[PDB]
Amino acid sequence: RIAALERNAFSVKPSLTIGYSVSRTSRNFDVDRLFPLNADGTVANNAFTSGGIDTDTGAQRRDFGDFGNASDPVVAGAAGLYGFADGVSYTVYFTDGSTATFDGLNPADYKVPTGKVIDTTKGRNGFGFNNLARYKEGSTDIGISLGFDTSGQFSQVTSGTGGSLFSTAGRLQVNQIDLNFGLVTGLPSDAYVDTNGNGKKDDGEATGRGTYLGSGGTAAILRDPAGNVYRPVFFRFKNATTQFSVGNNPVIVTLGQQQKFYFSDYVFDNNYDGRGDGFTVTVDGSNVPVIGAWKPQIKGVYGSRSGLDGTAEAGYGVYYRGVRAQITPVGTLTAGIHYAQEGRDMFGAAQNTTSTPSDVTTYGADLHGKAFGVELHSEYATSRVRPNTANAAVQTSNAFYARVATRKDNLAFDLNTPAAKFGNDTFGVSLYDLNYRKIDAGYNNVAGISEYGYGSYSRTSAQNIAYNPDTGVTAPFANLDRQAYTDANNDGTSDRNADGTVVATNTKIGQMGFGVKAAANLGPVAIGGYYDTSTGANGDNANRMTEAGGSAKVAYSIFSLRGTYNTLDSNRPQIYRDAAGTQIIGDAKVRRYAVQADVTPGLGLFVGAYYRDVNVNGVRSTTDRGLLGRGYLASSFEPGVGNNAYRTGLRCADNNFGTGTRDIDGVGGVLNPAVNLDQSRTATCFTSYGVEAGHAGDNANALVKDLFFRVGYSRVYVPTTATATTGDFSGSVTYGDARYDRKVGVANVRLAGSFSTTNTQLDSRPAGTRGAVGLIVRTDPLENVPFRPQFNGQVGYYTADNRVAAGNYNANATKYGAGVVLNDFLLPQTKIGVRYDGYMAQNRQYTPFDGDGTQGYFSDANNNRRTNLNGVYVEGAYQDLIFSYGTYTLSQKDLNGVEYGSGINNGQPARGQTFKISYKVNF
Amino acid sequence: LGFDTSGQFSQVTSGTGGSLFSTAGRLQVNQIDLNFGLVTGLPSDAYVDTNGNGKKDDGEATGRGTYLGSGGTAAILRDPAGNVYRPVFFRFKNATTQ
C-alpha cells in the first residue's frame, strides 16, 4: 500500500535564492581574458563573468563584458578598444521620427541613410550618443520557486483490444515510453505560444510570460495586499517517444512520426532526420527451417512526407513506399535488392506548388561484406524521375560503384587497412583500394529518394568523395560539378567577392573513373603506389583529373630513408591561387618529390633532414596551392623500423615549422596549458629543404622526463620576383620551441617557450623575429606554515617584429597574475583570497567570435595603441557566505598618450567595480 | 477547494560556494517563514503589480479580471455538461528576509 501511494505521489521541491549584488562600470569591458587557463583550456572561474559560452557560435566568456547587469559583447576595431570593450554606437535621428543606430567612432561616416530618411537635428547634430555606462544598483534579491515532480513510474504502456471486423485480445505488447512530466509554478523566459505549428518561435509569437501575467519576471506580479503572491500552475511534459513497435520474433511493425530508415546509400539514406509519418515492417527469417542460415531479411516502409504540412511545402500530398530484401550467403557478404518509390497523390498533384517530382521510382542492389579474405562493396541504382510539369519526359539516372576496400562501422571507407593481404611481413603485397565509379550527372538526393547528398563534400579536399559526416551522406563517390567564372552583372571581367575570392557557377557533370592503391612490403624495404583518374559521367577529357604517385621507404636499425613522388593532372577547372596570389579557375599540373631521412638514437631524441620540391604548372612553385589534396589517395609512408603502413595523406606537416598567428591568451600561446607549441605544424607543402632536431618527454628512457623541444632550421624556395621561372632557396626559417612541466616541491611549475626568425611571409605569418616565453606556478596548500596558504602565479612575455610591406612594427605583450588563498583564517571555516591580474599590449588586438563555429583570438595589428588592462579581485568567505569584490581598469593609449579608453574623450580609463554577497541554500 | 502542505519546509541548509576556493557546505541551518499552498481561484483584492511598488496603483489589473473564471460572478468558465473549471494558482508568502 505504501508503494501504491508512492507511485502516484508528488515530490515537492522548493527553491530559494539569496544574494546581494552591486556593480558600477563606465565602459563595460571584459575581464575573463586576465584569468588563468585550465589544463583543459577553460578559463578560471570568477564571480564577475557574464557567461556566454556558446559552442554553436563560438562565443566564449572573453567575448562579453562583465560589469553592470549588461553582457555587452566586445567590439572589434576602434569603436571598441580594438576588441577590448564595448562599441561607441551613436544614435541617428530621422525626419519622420524614426531612429537608427550607427556603430562607429565617427558619425559622419554614416553612409547608410535609408531611401527617404533625413537626419533631423534633434540630438547634437542629428546624432545622439548611446551612454556607455552600466549600473547595477545594489540590492538583495530573494527568489522563491516551487515544483512538483512525479515518481517517474509511468514509463510503460500496454496495448488494448481493438478492431471492427474482429476484436484483438489486448494486453499483448508492452511499450517503453520516454515521457517526462511534472507540475511547474511559473513559465520559463523562452516559452512562447506556437500558433502556427512549426514548433519554432516566429516573429513575436506570444512571449508566454506575457500571455500568463504573473508567471515570471518582474513586469507583472499577481499580488495581494496581505502580501500573498499567486502564480499559475502548469503541467509541463516532454515526449521523447514517437515510435511504437509491435511483435517479437519474426515480424516487427513500428508506427510513428518522422520514421528513419535506410535501404542503402543512393536510395533511402533517409536516416539522421527521417522522411515522414507512417510505419515500417521488418521480417527476419534467421530461424526458418529450410533457409535460415543465410539470415534472410525483409524491410518495408510506408509513409507520408513530413506528415501533414501546409501547401507550398515539398511534402504536401507526397507519399513514399519501399521494400528491401537481403541475405548473407557467405561469411559476411550481404547481398540485397530494394525498390523505392515516392509520389504525389491527387491532392498533391494539384495545389502543391514547389517542385517535387510527380514520381520517383528507384531500384537497386548492393553486395557489401567480407567473404574470402577480401572485402567487397558494390552498389547499383536506377532513378526514373518523373519531373512534374505537363510533358515531364521522364529522366533516368544510374549510380554504380564496385570497390575492394575496408569500410568502417560508420560506413566510412578506411583506406589504411589493406583488405587483401596477399602475404606475410617478409613478403607482404597489400591491396588497399581497387574501385570503379559510374555515377551519372543527374543523380542527386531526388533521383535516389534520400534527404541530402551525392555531391562533393569539399571540392578542395578529396572531391571525388560524397561522404558527408555532417548530413549523414554515407556514399563513397560524389556527383562532380564543373566550375567556371560567373560574370553576373559586369561584362568583360569575372565576378569577385569583397575579399577578392572568385564567384563560380557549378554545373553537375557526374563522375566516372577508377582507382587502385597498393603497397608491397619487402624486408628492410617497403614500396607503395596509387593511381586514380576520374572524368565526367559522359567521359569527356575536359573534366579529367588524374593523380598518380608512389613512395619507397628503407628502415634499418635507427635510420629511415623515404622517397615520395606525387603527381596531379587536372583538366578539371579547380579553384586555387596562382603565383601572384589571386584566386583563379583553371586546369592544374602539380609534380612533387620529397626525400626525407630520419635518425632516432633511442634516448628520446630525434633528428630529421628533408628536401621537398614542388612544381606547379611547370614552375618551381615555392608553395603548392593545396592542389595535391584534391585526391583521396595520397598514401605516404612513416618513419621508423617496422612501420610499413601505407597511410592515406601526404604528411606535408612533417619536420616543418608552424605558421600560427592567433592565440587564446594575450601572449602567443606560451601561457596556455592546453596548447603544445612544440607540436604546431603548418600543414602546407613547400619547396624547401632543412633539418630539425628535437626531444620527446613521453617516450621512455628520455634525457628529461617531461621535456619537449623542437629546434629546427629550413630554407624555402622563392621565385625571382613574383612569377619568374628562375628563383633560389633564399628564404630562411629558424624556429625553436620548449615545454617543461616538472613539479619541484609542493608547487607545480610549467615553462613554455617559442622562437622564430622567418625571412619571408610563409602562409599568414609576416617576415620577422617572433619570440615568447611563459611560466605558470601553482602551489598546493601548505600545511606547515600557518593559515595553510596556497599560492599561484603566471608570467608571459611575447615579442614580434612584423616586417610587413606597410611597416616594420613591433607587437609585444606582457601578462602577469598572482594570488594567495588562506584556507584557515582566524575563525573556523573562514577563508580569504586575493588575485591581482595585469595585461599590457603594444600593437595587438582581439577579434571576437564571428557568430559561426570560429572563436575569437588575439592577433597583431598596426594600431598605434597600448592597452593596459589591470584588476584586483578579493574573495573572502565566512562559513558559507561568500563576499566577492573586484576593481578593474582598462586604458588604451596611443603613441601620443591620448587615453582613448572610456570613449567620451575625457582622458580617463574605463573602470569597473563589483561587489557580491552569495549564499547557496537548499531545502 | 484548497491544497495545504505539510508545513515541514521551514529550514534551509547552506551549500558550498566560492570561486578562488570552495566552502565546505552544510555549515549553517536557517529557519525560514515561507507559507505556501495551492488555491483554486483568486481573492477580490488580488492585482497584477506591473511597476514593482507592491501596491495597487490606478486600476492595475484586478487579477480576477486577468484570469477569467478565477472568482466572482462576472465570468465563469463552464461546460454544457455542468462542469466548472477554475485555474489553479501556487500561493505563497515569504516573511523571512534576513
Added chain:
Amino acid sequence: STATFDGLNPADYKVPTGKVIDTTKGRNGFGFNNLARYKEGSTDIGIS
C-alpha cells in the same frame, strides 16, 4: 459580402438580400465550393 446558395443551379438564387448585388467576381458572380475533402496522412500522438 458573400452568401452560400444550396442548389445545383445558381440561376435559381431567388434570395438576394435587400441591397446586395451579385458582383462578377467568380464565374459570373457565383463561385463553387470544392467538393473534395483531404486528410493528409500523418501519425498523431496525443498526451493528456
Added chain:
Amino acid sequence: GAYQDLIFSYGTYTLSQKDLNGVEYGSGINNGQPARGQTFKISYKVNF
C-alpha cells in the same frame, strides 16, 4: 487486418448516380466520373 494489437484498416468506395441516358452525375463537377472515397488507418490502443 490486425497484428498483435495494431489494426490496419483500408477502405475504397465508389458512388455513381446515373440517369436514364447515363450522364453519371456523381462527383457533381460534371465530368462524368463517380464520387470516390479512400481511407487508410493504423490504430493502436495503449494504456498506462
Added chain:
Amino acid sequence: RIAALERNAFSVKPSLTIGYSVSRTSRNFDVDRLFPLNADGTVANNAF
C-alpha cells in the same frame, strides 16, 4: 495512517493516443448505409 494518506491523495491518470490516418475523397458520401444492421437495429461498427 495509510488510510489517512490515501483519503486526500491524487490518482495520476496519464493518457496516450497513437494513430496514423489518411483519407482522400472527391464528394464525401456516406458508407454506413452499406453495413449490416444488428439485431438491435444498430449498424455494424467500422473504422470509417
